[PDB]
């Protein structure tokens, strides 16, 4: 049936320090116009299955 429990990150503002942990599922603004917490153009959910 396909496992959707495994989620991995694709978009981030910057890189990760060694042995770092990030869990914040914040909306990512991919463009000039801020998303203001609203999914849309230039806005993507950072986690993918």
């Amino acid at each position: 049936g396909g496992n959707y429990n495994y989620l991995y990150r694709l978009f981030r503002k910057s890189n990760l320090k060694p042995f770092e942990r990030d869990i914040s599922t914040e909306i990512y603004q991919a463009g000039s116009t801020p998303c203001n917490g609203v999914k849309g153009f230039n806005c993507y959910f950072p986690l993918q299955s």
């Binding site: 991919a30 463009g31 000039s32 153009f41």
Partner: protein, 49 residues
């Protein structure tokens, strides 16, 4: 615009191209970039388009 079976082909060479304004344009319904990220277009470049 020419028909699909006779798609118009254009060669771009020896000029500066500002992709930031093209990406920020909201008139485009579908915008899909595969080889490189749209944000980093202005940094690296090839010999022709």
């Amino acid at each position: 615009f020419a028909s699909v079976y006779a798609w118009n082909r254009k060669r771009i060479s020896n000029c500066v191209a500002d992709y930031s304004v093209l990406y920020n344009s909201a008139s485009f319904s579908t915008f899909k970039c595969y080889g490189v990220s749209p944000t980093k277009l202005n940094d690296l470049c090839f010999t022709n388009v």
